[PDB]
Design a binder for this molecule. Structure first.
Ligand SMILES: CN[C@@H]1CCc2c(ccc(O)c2O)[C@H]1O
Lengths: 233, 331, 285, 52
């Protein structure tokens, strides 16, 4: 009868030591959620990097990315699980503005609006990836399936002077790319209170620096979180 | 053509249920004495979890309980001495439910991975990995030492056999992601609720849906079954909690207040069935007088949202595990 | 009499404000589990230092000023002086380590979680308090701070008078250990934090210039200006009166010392403006 | 599809049900009978209470 308490105390001490080690390991790593459409090209981003988890480390920092496979349901109740993630990586194909499979771009905009305006994901920032940039350029310069017909607001839109055009680029596709970015940006800024931001990136399949981009975006996210905990920023 | 027949059948069901409304539960229960105010103090606080807790399950003996968290740890506590008997790492970090076998030898857990893992406590390794679901698995309960029912986001509930690892019986026809299920005191029957407002009753042996109830207006996050075996109360994302009756086929009373607008994540009944304890999206937890639908007391000790609620078999203790790692035992 | 009564009322108000704020902060941190954090441990250390200040050295000093006589023993005078030095240096060094914590959390965010933990926070607080003790108790209890000139020895011989007379070496060393080194550390870390905040603001403006969507300036201004305007005027004259014997009068020295004391009560207002602390205070009262 | 749904509703329709008054009376009687052995409803003595 007396030895039972001692055995329980020893087991508790061993479990507590293991839990402290797990505390260190868990706090070391960062968790990211990968959301996108099936044709958005998330597989391309995964290759560069029920549920698929890929672990990558850069600059001796452990990053854990979780991609939810299947579960193709409009209603998302599992998404409340990803409340402690560092960021939500959103992948959208900007070249799919014309595909019927409600346009794909409009469906992605609606999905981004739903994710942004979620009670659980209030503090979680979103990293936005715009794949198939080359395909978008090929479509825009082709002269077929103009943005204006699919997106009426494109006609009134004007290219922003305070932009960063590519070193070798065509003004028409630059206008298209910045309009596609600005749609998501205005969805982001309409309801954000400064607790979470959106980082739009023009990515490509050939590009291999997306890991560095996600690392920088996570650094900025944590830095802004720490700044906003205090009255600064 | 068939849609007209379905509409006629639904109208017939509505008329038949309206015919049995002899007197509401409020009219009969208004004569009985009020339960009064119940104040509950946190007797034990259990610490050691790393992330938010989703589900717990009291043991058949009131001493032991098991809890699950987003670290991937399935910690088993001795609630009397606040001692972690076992700490079970999980293959997948995401887990949304847990269960503790009535014999006390097995523990099961499952999450966004469709596989349901069953652990052998007395031997701690994975005795069997139950696979076959398509969506995220939401709840688990042990019918016996060899049978387990799992409800997933596949909009189906399944009955498993641990020895063979196959779905002995599959329950279908339920239009939403099933969130929670509860068993009768006897093994014969169980009930479940999903994202659609409908909560359905099932028969384990036959595998067919005997009854359905559509009282709610939003997703049914939680469900609990009355100790008498003839009623069950379901929580919802809507602030209402409603008590249904199997023999009557419609709700008897509704538990809500205009002050509260948050949803309900976990419900449970006291041993006598008088007190209906229900967790809420806001930080506190509420205690409802089931007979009279008057809030008896409030259990406010949690910093974050309450995700799991349980009452032990003998009714001595009430355990609440919120989205902070702290799990508290009330009494 | 009227002036004495007014001064007594003012010092009593100061003492009550200090003790009330510090006990409120300490009990808010102790009672609520969510208020326990690595930074909140440093906050608790600073609150404890200010509470010991307001309980031990402010009321006794007020009584000494009003009565114009030290009724207690000479050992009690030494003990009061030592606790005064201990409290001041502990509070200032705790402010310095809080600034270092903020700098490490902002400048290097990825490695911040591993760099500082609860055990490391406890070790840091213990080191700060041991440094404070070695600065205060050792030279005073062992009487290494005793001056040489006739006024100091006359004051020390008389048990009814308790005045502060210190050597050049101890005054310089105590000032450097207490204020100037933490002042330099805080200034550097807060300048770096301001630069990082401005860089982040410029990045946000670049990303969302066309859409609609100061504070850092106000926050750093209050945080650094309160501490500086409270303690720098005292420490400059602390060095000067040692350097120049006739430059600083006793009344000016005591007035600047009490202005420095007021920082103990000002600290909880600055360092407990977070919404969680506000919720805890509202629930307590 | 729709045939399965209409068959399910048809099977569900033909079930005997009791009046709400009888079910509520049974629930109230059960609660009154088992209220005695309810540690939550009636606080247990400190010696009897295991946790405290
Ligand atoms: C009696 N007043 C003392 C005298 C000198 C001194 C103080 C505080 C901190 C220091 O580091 C000091 O050297 C003052 O509070």
């Amino acid at each position: 009868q007396r030895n039972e308490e001692k055995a329980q105390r020893e087991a508790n001490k061993k479990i507590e030591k293991q839990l402290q080690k797990d505390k260190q390991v868990y706090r070391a790593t960062h968790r990211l959620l990968l959301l996108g459409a099936g044709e958005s090209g998330k597989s391309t981003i995964v290759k560069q990097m029920g549920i698929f988890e890929t672990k990558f480390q850069v600059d001796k920092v452990n990053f854990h990315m979780f991609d939810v496979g299947g579960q193709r349901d409009e209603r998302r109740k599992w998404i409340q699980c990803f409340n402690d993630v560092t960021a939500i990586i959103f992948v959208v194909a900007s070249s799919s503005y014309n595909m019927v499979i409600t346009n794909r771009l409009q469906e992605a905009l609606n999905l981004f609006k739903s994710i942004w305006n979620n009670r659980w994901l209030r503090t979680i920032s979103v990293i936005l990836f715009l794949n198939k940039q080359d395909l978008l350029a090929e479509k825009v310069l082709a002269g077929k399936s103009k943005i204006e017909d699919y997106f009426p607001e494109f006609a009134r839109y004007t290219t922003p002077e305070d932009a960063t055009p590519e070193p070798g680029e065509d003004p028409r596709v630059t206008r298209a790319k910045y309009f596609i970015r600005d749609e998501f940006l205005r969805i982001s800024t309409a309801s954000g209170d400064g607790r979470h931001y959106c980082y739009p990136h023009f990515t490509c399949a050939v590009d291999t620096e997306n890991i560095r981009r996600v690392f920088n975006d996570c650094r900025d996210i944590i830095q802004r979180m720490h700044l906003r905990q205090y009255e600064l920023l | 053509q068939l849609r007209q027949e379905a509409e006629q059948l639904k109208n017939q069901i509505r008329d038949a249920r309206k015919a049995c409304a002899d007197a509401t539960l409020s009219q009969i229960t208004n004569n009985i004495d009020p339960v009064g105010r119940i104040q509950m103090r946190t007797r034990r606080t259990l610490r050691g979890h790393l992330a938010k807790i989703y589900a717990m399950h009291w043991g058949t003996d009131s001493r032991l309980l098991v809890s699950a968290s987003q670290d991937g740890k399935l910690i088993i506590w001795d609630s009397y001495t606040t001692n972690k008997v076992h700490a079970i790492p999980l293959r997948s970090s995401w887990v949304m439910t847990c269960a503790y076998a009535p014999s006390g030898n097995y523990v099961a857990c499952g999450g966004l991975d469709n596989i349901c893992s069953i652990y052998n406590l007395k031997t701690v390794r994975v005795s069997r990995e139950l696979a076959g679901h398509t969506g995220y698995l939401s709840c688990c309960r042990f019918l016996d030492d060899n049978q387990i029912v799992t409800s997933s986001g596949d909009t189906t509930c399944a009955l498993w056999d641990i020895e063979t690892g196959q779905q002995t019986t599959t329950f279908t026809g339920h239009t939403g992601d099933v969130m929670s299920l509860s068993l009768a005191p006897d093994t014969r029957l169980f009930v479940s609720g999903a994202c659609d407002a409908s909560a359905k009753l099932w028969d384990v042996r036959e595998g067919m849906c005997r009854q359905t109830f559509t009282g709610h207006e939003s997703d049914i996050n939680a469900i609990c079954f009355f100790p008498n075996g003839n009623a069950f109360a379901t929580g919802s994302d809507d602030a209402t909690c409603r008590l249904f009756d199997l023999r009557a086929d419609q709700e008897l009373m509704t538990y809500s207040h205009d002050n509260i607008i948050c949803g309900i994540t976990s419900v449970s009944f006291s041993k006598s069935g008088r007190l209906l304890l229900a967790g809420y999206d806001d930080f506190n937890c509420n205690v409802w007088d089931a007979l009279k639908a008057d809030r008896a007391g409030v259990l406010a000790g949690h910093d974050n949202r309450v995700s799991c609620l349980g009452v032990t078999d003998d009714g001595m203790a009430v355990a609440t595990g919120s989205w902070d790692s702290f799990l508290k035992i009330w009494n | 009499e009227v002036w004495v009564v007014g001064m007594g009322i003012v010092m009593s108000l100061i003492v009550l404000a200090i003790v009330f704020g510090n006990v409120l902060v300490i009990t808010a941190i102790a009672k609520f589990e969510r208020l326990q954090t690595v930074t909140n441990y440093f906050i608790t250390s600073l609150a404890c230092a200010d509470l010991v200040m307001g309980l031990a050295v402010v009321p006794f000093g007020a009584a000494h000023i009003l009565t114009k006589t030290w009724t207690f023993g000479n050992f009690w005078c030494e003990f009061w002086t030592s606790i005064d030095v201990l409290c001041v240096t502990a509070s200032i060094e705790t402010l310095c380590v809080i600034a270092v914590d903020r700098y490490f959390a902002i400048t290097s965010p990825f490695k911040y979680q591993s760099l500082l933990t609860k055990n490391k926070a406890r070790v840091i607080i213990l080191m700060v308090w041991i440094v404070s003790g070695l600065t205060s108790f050792l030279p005073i209890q062992m009487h290494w701070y005793r001056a040489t000139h006739q006024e100091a020895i006359n004051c020390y011989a008389e048990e009814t008078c308790c005045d502060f007379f210190t050597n050049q070496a101890y005054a310089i060393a105590s000032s450097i250990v207490s204020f100037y080194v933490p002042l330099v550390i805080m200034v550097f870390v807060y300048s770096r934090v301001f630069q990082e905040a401005k860089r982040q603001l410029q990045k946000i403006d670049k990303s969302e210039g066309r859409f609609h969507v100061h504070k850092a300036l106000k926050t750093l201004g209050i945080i650094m200006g309160t501490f500086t305007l409270c303690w720098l005027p005292f420490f400059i004259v602390n060095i000067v009166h040692v350097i120049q014997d006739n430059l600083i009068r006793k009344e000016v020295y005591i007035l600047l010392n009490w202005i420095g004391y007021v920082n103990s009560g000002f600290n909880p207002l600055i360092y407990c403006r977070s919404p969680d602390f506000r919720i805890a205070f509202q629930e307590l009262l | 599809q729709a045939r399965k749904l209409v068959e399910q509703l048809k099977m569900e329709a033909n079930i005997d049900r009791i009046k709400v008054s009888k079910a509520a009376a049974d629930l109230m009687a059960y609660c009154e009978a088992h209220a005695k052995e309810d540690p939550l409803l009636t606080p247990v003595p400190a010696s009897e209470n295991p946790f405290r």
